[PDB]
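quick one: sodium ion bound model?
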Amino acid sequence: KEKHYYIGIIETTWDYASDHGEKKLISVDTEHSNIYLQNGPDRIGRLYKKALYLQYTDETFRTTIEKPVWLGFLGPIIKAETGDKVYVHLKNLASRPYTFHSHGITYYKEHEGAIYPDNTTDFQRADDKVYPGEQYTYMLLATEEQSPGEGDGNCVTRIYHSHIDAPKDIASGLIGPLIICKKDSLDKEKEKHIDREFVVMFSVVDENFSWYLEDNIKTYCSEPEKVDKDNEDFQESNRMYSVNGYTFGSLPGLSMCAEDRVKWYLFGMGNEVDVHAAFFHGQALTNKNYRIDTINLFPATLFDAYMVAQNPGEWMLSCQNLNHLKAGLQAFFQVQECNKSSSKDNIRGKHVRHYYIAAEEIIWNYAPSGIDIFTKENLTAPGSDSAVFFEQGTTRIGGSYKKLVYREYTDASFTNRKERGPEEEHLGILGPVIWAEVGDTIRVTFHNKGAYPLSIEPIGVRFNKNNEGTYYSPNVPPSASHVAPTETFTYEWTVPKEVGPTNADPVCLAKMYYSAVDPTKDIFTGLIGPMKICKKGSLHANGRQKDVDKEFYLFPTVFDENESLLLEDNIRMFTTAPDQVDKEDEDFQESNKMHSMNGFMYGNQPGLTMCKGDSVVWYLFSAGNEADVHGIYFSGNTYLWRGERRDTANLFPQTSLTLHMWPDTEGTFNVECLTTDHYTGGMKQKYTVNQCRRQSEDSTFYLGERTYYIAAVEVEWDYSPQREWEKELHHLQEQNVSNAFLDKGEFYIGSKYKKVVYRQYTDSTFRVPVERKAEEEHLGILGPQLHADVGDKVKIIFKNMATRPYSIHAHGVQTESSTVTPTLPGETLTYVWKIPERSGAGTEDSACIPWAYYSTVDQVKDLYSGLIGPLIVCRRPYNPRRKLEFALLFLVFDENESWYLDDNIKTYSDHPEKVNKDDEEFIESNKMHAINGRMFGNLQGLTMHVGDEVNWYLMGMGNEIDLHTVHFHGHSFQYKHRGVYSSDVFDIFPGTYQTLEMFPRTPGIWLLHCHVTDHIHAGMETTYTVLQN
Ligand SMILES: *[C@@H]1O[C@H](CO)[C@@H](O)[C@H](O)[C@H]1NC(C)=O
Ligand SMILES: *[C@@H]1O[C@H](CO)[C@@H](O)[C@H](O)[C@H]1NC(C)=O
Ligand SMILES: [Ca+2]
Ligand SMILES: [Cu+2]
Ligand SMILES: [Cu+2]
Ligand SMILES: [Cu+2]
Ligand SMILES: [Cu+2]
Ligand SMILES: [Cu+2]
Ligand SMILES: [Cu+2]
Ligand code: NA
Ligand SMILES: [O]
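yep, here:
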């Protein structure tokens, strides 16, 4: 059908915590809220003016249609079913220009609502700048191409926002939800067997970026003269950590019944600090028929989830990013009894597993050997990167910290202690494994031999209010939420089918438990452990999975000892001058950020050993804050996850993953974090795979043979050869702005740096480089796109025409040795990459998948210096439509880490003498936020036709900062085998390699960008062109 909405943009005053109390939130004392909510002489408080979308009954925009209270400031909910034509009648009643741009629906250029250089004419531009008092009516068509995929639910979450300066428009308040549904799955604007629909935007809503900042300062700050917009504390006080714009618990309206079938539409929004971990303390959810609880959201991440509300009472919805939790990213919801009126599991007291766990103080050395196992270098080597963390002296703790750690004892006295064996040598700091099967009951007798009160909070199991490990509320014998320094308490959790693995899940799921009297300090103090929840009849009496040789539990995180309950205690036991230590000095706190796996650093983790051919399950999980974006890479072997083949697992606060691996080659390999600073900081370990059988000789499995001649060449690389697109963008936006990254001013470098890049040659003489033709113009900085099929042996003849050692190696591929030999300058070496079945698609991948190739001599610096490329591995050779391929690398090139920094100062700075490599402004000037090493629409060659199929190969690498939410204007993509899932933003992080299918249908020049604020603004964007057929 054809549907009409009337949406006005008005200016209005918005309250971020409309009272009314009195609350206790997790990890938030009753005074902390003042930071953000307290009006003052130099602080705005909790009221702000902003621009919001409202719904109207009528073309005479006078009577509003009120929204549900839980929506907050979000625009009104728009819905559509496949086949529907939606007309959005916008009227702008604010003081400045805005638009309506919608994410998951098809439109011509007249109806995109976004301004940018696309060669359009006046009649396709009226949509892109709706002036005050002006009115524009947008035509949207819900096509099949944009429909939810066969593997999605009936409805998916999409958004709409203003898109002049989207970041600032959205910060100002113009963001709302657009729910797209299959036909005929809707009945009277609600989905057919769903009782409740809620939408929840998680975001650090940043009023510093609003168009109304100055109006707000002028209005509320009783001393406007004394405000410094760039003072860091003032900025914090305007960062409103919110769900739907509600802070500190004040989200009202989230009420439901026991039994109710609920659909949640979640999204993230904002900047680099918007690393969220949405958590329903409830409460168990499914996403895509998989059990989850936690969901991670980033700027523009679109997600949906299904919940049969159960376990009646007052619950918390929160962000488990500990920095967020403690700034109040928390909303209550309630499940009331109405009464039942259903039934089900039932199982309580039948199969009982009984654990006895104590909390106790130890001195944990994060690196017992005292050396870095990968380099054999002494950790305190003056000048080394490890020295920052392991140096000990007048104002510096070192490698070893007093911690609190869970440990297992034999029975209900605490006389004895279950000694750890070989199977648990790798656990390290982690507490004992809690394991249960669906249908079991779990009792945990917890005893506290520490000096602070503690608890145990499990993720992934069922527990009533009497057993909850955290305390919170909307309005001393020990309890679930509080076991004090000498006391003891026995928790009861259940594991019913509705909280355990579904048919689509694997046999066991990775979960975790931690103390949560204050989880923002307890975890880092050391109170974290692994859990494993499995299907009925899948484990042995001893806890081991039936047909599985090995099971490992990995918890990588940044152990922020600055947040440890034992910090002061540690300062007084380890520094040789305790009084001179400033607990606020940046350098000091870096020295206490311990980047580690199971509390181990610099290759010192023991006990990851296994036989070749072994069946191995890896249980990964993490915790922490925004710094915790991890890409755990298993060199030398791949794994399956949800039928996808990968070798690098992405993890965020409270993320957990179950990986299946069959290691296929003898050696000692690395398990390490790809994320640049984590690696440098010591997040790297070995795992050994031994030979325990024969030993055949050769299985003659070379269906295919290829050879490629590639060189590293030093080249002058320009991140922005032209500036016309940028000038036009900023002109269209009316922005007085200038460019930190590209403007030389007095002495900065600019857009051109000497780099080293891979390039293809025609033969072994290396004297004729291969012509890059039209369909490879888009590669930019990337090395050539190499192809291989499963079955192939790929010879890489590699010449180093550069001036220091380098190599070339690919993710995914199998080689004979775990070490990669460096190629010296002038040398040519041969590397052989075998492509067995495990180097290619899993059963649920598309036919072609991408893997990064890169140099291993110094993985951080060689990368930032320019050496990176895509290897595409395809399945099995065995109609009219043209198939295209594009590889895209989303990476912030950090020129401060290039081997060529010094040269680039001497060559490109007008006054090199005045450069200080350690100055924060110079540092920023060399962080080049690029796509394939080009910015601001300087990446050409993304050109295609209506009717084509396009495989996009998205790749991510880099640092903590390198979260990238890749978004294509005008079109959606599908992914997975047979295009089963569907969306228009894909999350990309370091180590994330994904293939997306696109079937372009709408002619136009369309914007392609990362949706993270700082990244758009720094030019991480280009356009792609769709031509008529
Ligand atoms: C826009 O127009 C110019 C001038 O006609 C053309 O040469 C240029 O390639 C166009 N831009 C794109 C992205 O197609
Ligand atoms: C590292 O060097 C110091 C002296 O510079 C020495 O005392 C220490 O034992 C060394 N560590 C190891 C593990 O060899
Ligand atoms: Ca337009
Ligand atoms: Cu958007
Ligand atoms: Cu968050
Ligand atoms: Cu990491
Ligand atoms: Cu980005
Ligand atoms: Cu868009
Ligand atoms: Cu956009
Ligand atoms: Na404030
Ligand atoms: O979009």
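DSSP finds 16 helices and 62 strands in the chain.
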